[PDB]
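Operator note (shift B, R.M.): manual run for Chignolin requested after the automated queue skipped it. Running by hand, logging everything below so the morning shift can see what happened. Input copied straight from the record, untouched. If output looks odd, do not overwrite the archive copy; leave it for review.
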Amino acid sequence: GYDPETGTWG
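Run finished. Output pasted below as returned.
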């Protein structure tokens, strides 16, 4: 999914 921790699709 789109990991918001880094701001990109893990």
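Quick read of the result: The two ends are 7 Å apart (CA to CA). DSSP finds no helices and two strands in the chain.
Leaving this for review. - R.M.
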